[PDB]
Amino acid sequence: PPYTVVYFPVRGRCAALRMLLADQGQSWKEEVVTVETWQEGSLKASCLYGQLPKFQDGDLTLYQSNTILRHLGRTLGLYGKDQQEAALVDMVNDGVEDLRCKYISLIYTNYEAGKDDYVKALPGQLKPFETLLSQNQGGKTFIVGDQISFADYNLLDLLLIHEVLAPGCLDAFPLLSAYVGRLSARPKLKAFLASPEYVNLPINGNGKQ
Amino acid sequence: PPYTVVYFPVRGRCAALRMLLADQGQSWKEEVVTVETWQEGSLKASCLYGQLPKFQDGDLTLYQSNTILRHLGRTLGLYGKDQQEAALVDMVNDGVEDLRCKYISLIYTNYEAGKDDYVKALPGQLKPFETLLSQNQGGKTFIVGDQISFADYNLLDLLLIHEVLAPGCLDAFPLLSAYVGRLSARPKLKAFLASPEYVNLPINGNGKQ
Ligand SMILES: *S(=O)(=O)c1cccc(S(=O)(=O)N2CC(Cn3c(-c4ccc(Cn5nc(C)c([N+](=O)[O-])c5C)o4)nc4cc(C(=O)NC)ccc43)C2)c1
Ligand SMILES: N[C@@H](CCC(=O)N[C@@H](CS)C(=O)NCC(=O)O)C(=O)O
Numbered sequence: 216p217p218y219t220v221v222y223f224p225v226r227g228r229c230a231a232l233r234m235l236l237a238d239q240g241q242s243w244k245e246e247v248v249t250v251e252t253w254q255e256g257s258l259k260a261s262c263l264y265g266q267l268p269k270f271q272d273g274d275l276t277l278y279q280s281n282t283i284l285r286h287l288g289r290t291l292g293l294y295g296k297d298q299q300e301a302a303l304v305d306m307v308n309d310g311v312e313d314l315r316c317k318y319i320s321l322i323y324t325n326y327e328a329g330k331d332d333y334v335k336a337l338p339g340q341l342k343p344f345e346t347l348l349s350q351n352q353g354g355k356t357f358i359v360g361d362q363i364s365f366a367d368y369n370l371l372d373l374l375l376i377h378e379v380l381a382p383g384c385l386d387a388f389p390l391l392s393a394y395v396g397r398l399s400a401r402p403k404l405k406a407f408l409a410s411p412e413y414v415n416l417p418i419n420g421n422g423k424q
Numbered sequence: 425p426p427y428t429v430v431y432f433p434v435r436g437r438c439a440a441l442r443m444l445l446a447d448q449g450q451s452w453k454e455e456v457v458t459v460e461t462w463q464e465g466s467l468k469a470s471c472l473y474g475q476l477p478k479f480q481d482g483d484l485t486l487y488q489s490n491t492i493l494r495h496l497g498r499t500l501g502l503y504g505k506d507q508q509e510a511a512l513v514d515m516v517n518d519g520v521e522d523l524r525c526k527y528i529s530l531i532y533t534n535y536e537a538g539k540d541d542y543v544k545a546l547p548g549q550l551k552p553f554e555t556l557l558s559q560n561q562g563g564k565t566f567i568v569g570d571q572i573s574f575a576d577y578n579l580l581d582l583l584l585i586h587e588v589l590a591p592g593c594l595d596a597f598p599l600l601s602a603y604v605g606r607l608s609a610r611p612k613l614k615a616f617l618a619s620p621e622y623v624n625l626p627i628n629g630n631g632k633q
Contacts (some may be wrong), residue, residue: 263555275511278515279519281514282515286507287516289507289510289511298495298499301495301498302491303484305490305491305494306491307493330622343472
């Protein structure tokens with residue numbers, strides 16, 4: 216198997232790259248890291264920024280989830296068909312990252328106090344991606360151009376975890392909803408999304424969702 | 425003039441890309457947006473994510489500073505020599521981003537209370553970049569490979585603003601220090617870093633630093 220994913224037993228910042236790997240018919244080894252292993256200290260100390268995911272593609276070793284996604288996109292043709300489209304994919308993914316940061320802050324540092332304000336503010340954070348969809352072939356293909364990209368898998372995961380956090384949060388965004396259903400029903404992705412290696416994992420690392 | 429930058433009269437999220445543009449001998453028109461004009465509300469409602477910088481290259485239009493950086497590096501040859509080096513540059517820029525986010529957070533939401541602990545934690549946040557330099561040509565060329573990349577400009581700007589925040593914070597990191605000196609000696613970049621266009625601006629939108 217060409218790829219190794221080294222992460223905690225969490226969906227987290229690895230859910231999107233896992234989706235990408237599964238939907239593209241790739242195989243990969245999961246190295247699961249428990250609390251005991253991480254506290255041991257040597258794995259962490261070997262990690263560039265002392266964090267996970269760690270990712271192996273042959274004898275290339277990568278850290279940072281967004282770096283990993285861009286890498287897979289580069290080498291599996293999921294980065295747009297020209298340089299202009301590649302910039303657009305960078306835009307979209309960076310917006311996805313900003314919102315994911317806000318989500319992670321809510322989850323890990325302010326769930327009970329912040330959830331109401333967060334759900335009240337969420338439609339403003341989702342409207343940019345519906346605008347994006349509506350300007351690209353009526354939103355009936357992918358988020359950028361007419362072929363799938365790594366930003367699609369990233370945006371999809373962000374949308375799914377938000378539909379967990381605030382159910383019905385996509386009712387006001389018909390295009391984003393049809394987009395979730397369409398990408399979710401792709402066959403290899405569907406299979407992965409229903410497998411135990413996905414369902415048995417919590418979204419996050421602190422029991423909140 | 426091919427390029428248009430549309431950001432507040434600040435350095436902020438634009439200091440790096442400007443640096444790159446100046447160092448590559450590029451010309452660009454600056455459109456300056458005051459807080460009064462911003463607070464009017466129209467330009468903000470036309471911004472994809474409600475933020476600036478907004479960037480125009482021909483009739484391609486971009487938002488997000490990292491998107492702009494990656495686009496400039498893709499089109500100017502500052503994004504590695506092969507796919508592996510591009511992935512390493514990504515890994516570096518994302519590390520830079522994380523630290524930049526911590527810095528932005530401090531600067532805007534907790535300067536007085538949080539500066540002391542920010543400074544105490546800074547060496548561990550810098551140690552990875554010292555390690556990277558030590559494994560690429562003795563730290564005596566660039567952060568990745570043997571030619572400059574957009575990650576170099578973003579990292580340089582990060583280090584400069586941290587030296588202003590924590591004087592001598594590079595005392596313990598000889599390679600990062602010599603790096604700041606070397607890249608700043610580059611002719612076009614030195615010229616730009618002493619010009620009024622750069623010098624007359626505050627590091628951040630709220631004058632803290
Ligand atoms: S850049 O101008 O420094 C910049 C950095 C990050 C984000 C942006 S922005 O999205 O385009 N945007 C403009 C405004 C930043 N800003 C402010 C200001 C003071 C307090 C806040 C609220 N806030 N902003 C940020 C980034 C956070 N945060 O914690 O992440 C918070 C809570 O914004 N004041 C400003 C004054 C000027 C100016 O014209 N000075 C002479 C410019 C920008 C600016 C948020 C921009
Ligand atoms: N910027 C990183 C963030 C990864 C991250 O913070 N992961 C957490 C998992 S909850 C972690 O590594 N925590 C361990 C630590 O910092 O010791 C990425 O995108 O990969």
